[PDB]
Symmetry: C2
Subunit: 264 residues, 2 copies
C-alpha cells in the first residue's frame, strides 16, 4: 500500500503514530517528510529496547521512492525489504546481557557510575556533574532502569525486556477469549493445550508480521533545562516512564491482537 | 640560537626550566625540539594565570629560525617579535574579574558547580562523574582554588593573583638596596596546577593531597622567579 504506510506500520510497533502516510498526502512543505521519518524513527528506538543510544538514527527518501534507514550516516536497511531485514541489520550492532538489557553505554566508552548508588549521591551527580551515566539497576515492578545526561537533557530509561515471541503469546490469549464462536473457541483452547497457544492461533492461517521482530521493551523519559538538574524531577521521571512503558505495551498488545483477528 | 635562548627566558618567568637552547645545542631532532617547546609552553600556561586552559597551546620551529607560538592552531605571535607582542596577542582572549581570576571555564561553555561545595558532594563528583568543573573559592593565604576533570585527568589549581609590575618593583628596589624587552614585565607566576591520573583522578584523598601540593608549589615558584628577578 506504499512505502509510507510500510513505514507507518513499522512505527506502530513502538506505538508511534508517525502519520507519515497522511503527511505525504497533506499540503505541507517539501522536506518536512524526511524530518518526520527521522523524528518518528528516533522515538521508536527509545521504545524498542535495542540499546543503540550511542548511534545516530536517520530515515530519508531515496532516489527510487524507497525509505532508507541510516545508522551513523551509513545505509543500514530499506523499508521495502520488510521489517525482518531491519531486525538483522540492527543485530550485529547490539549487545544484550542475559536479562535483555543493552551492555552499551548511552554515552560511549567512559566511566559508568554504579546503578545502585544512594539517592543522596545520585542527586549530587544530577545537580552538579556535567555528562554522566549509571549502570542498569532493578526498579519496581520487575523493571530495570538507568539514567544519563548528554548536554542539557536528562535521560531516564525504564525497561522490561521481552522476546517478541512472548508478546505475540500475550496477544494470542487476549484474542482467543474475545472469540465469538464458542465452538471454535473451545477447539482453539484444546489445540492450545497441545500445540501451544500462539501456535494453535497461527495454525488457523509470522515473519511478515512487523511485531514479529520489534517490540516495546523500554521507554526513555527526557528532562531539559532546570528540571534536568532536579533530583525530585528525576524520581518523578522514573514513575512517568514506567507508566508510559505499561501504556505503550498495552497499546501494542491490543494492536497485534487486532492484527491476529484478520485471517481467522 | 638567539631564538631558543629567548624562549628559555620566557619560560623562566614561570619557573619552567625548558633547556631548549641546550637541547638544540645537543643536535636534537626538530621533532624533539617542537615537542620540548610545546611541553614547556603548556607548563608555563598552567602557572602564568592568564586563564587560557580552554585553548590548545603549541609552540613550533619555523624554516627562518623563529619559534611560532600558536593557540587552537592559530598563529598568535613569534618570539623574534618580543615578549610584548605575545602579551598583546594573549590579552584579547583572557577575561579577568576584580580579584584578577579567569572567568572562563577550563571545560568551555557548560555548567559550573559552586566553588564552595561540601567536601562530600565534591567526593561524589570525584568518584562517579565523568567530566565536571567548579568555580573559584576563597582559600587560605589569599589564594583561590578550583578543580575540574577532563578525560582521565583531574586538575587542581591554586592561584594567588599578583601583577608583574609589582614583582618587578620589589626586585628593583631590592637590587638598588644591593624593561619593555623583559618578559617579567608581562609574565609572572600567579598560579599552579597539579594533575592526577588514572585511579588517582577518582580518589578524594588524592585530590586533597594534590591541593596541599599545588599550594606549596605556587609559593615556591612565586618565590623562585622573584629571586631570579
Amino acid at each position: 500500500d506504499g512505502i509510507y504506510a510500510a513505514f507507518d506500520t513499522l512505527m506502530s510497533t513502538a506505538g508511534v503514530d508517525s502519520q507519515i502516510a497522511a503527511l505525504a498526502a497533506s499540503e505541507a512543505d517539501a522536506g518536512t517528510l524526511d524530518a518526520a521519518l527521522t523524528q518518528s524513527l528516533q522515538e521508536a528506538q527509545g521504545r524498542w529496547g535495542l540499546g543503540l543510544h550511542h548511534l545516530r538514527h536517520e530515515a530519508r527518501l531515496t532516489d527510487d521512492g524507497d525509505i532508507e534507514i541510516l545508522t551513523d550516516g551509513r545505509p543500514s536497511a530499506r523499508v521495502s525489504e520488510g521489517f525482518g531485514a531491519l531486525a538483522q541489520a540492527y543485530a550485529p550492532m547490539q549487545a544484550l546481557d542475559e536479562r535483555g538489557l543493552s551492555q552499551w553505554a548511552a554515552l560511549g566508552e567512559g566511566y559508568r557510575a554504579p546503578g545502585d548508588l544512594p539517592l543522596a549521591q545520585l542527586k549530587v551527580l544530577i545537580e552538579h556533574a556535567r555528562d554522566f551515566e549509571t549502570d542498569w539497576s532493578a526498579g519496581r515492578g520487575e523493571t530495570f532502569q538507568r539514567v544519563w545526561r548528554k548536554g542539557d537533557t536528562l535521560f531516564v530509561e525504564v525497561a522490561r525486556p521481552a522476546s517478541a515471541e512472548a508478546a505475540l503469546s500475550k496477544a494470542a490469549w487476549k484474542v482467543i477469549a474475545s472469540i465469538k464462536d464458542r465452538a471454535f473457541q473451545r477447539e482453539l483452547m484444546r489445540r492450545s493445550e497441545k500445540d501451544g497457544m500462539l501456535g494453535a492461533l497461527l495454525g488457523a492461517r509470522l515473519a511478515q508480521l512487523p511485531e514479529a521482530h520489534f517490540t516495546v521493551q523500554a521507554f526513555v523519559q527526557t528532562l531539559s533545562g532546570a528540571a534536568a538538574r532536579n533530583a525530585e524531577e528525576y524520581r518523578a521521571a522514573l514513575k512517568t516512564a514506567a507508566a508510559a512503558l505499561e501504556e505503550y505495551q498495552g497499546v501494542t498488545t491490543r494492536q497485534l491482537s487486532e492484527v491476529l483477528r484478520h485471517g481467522l
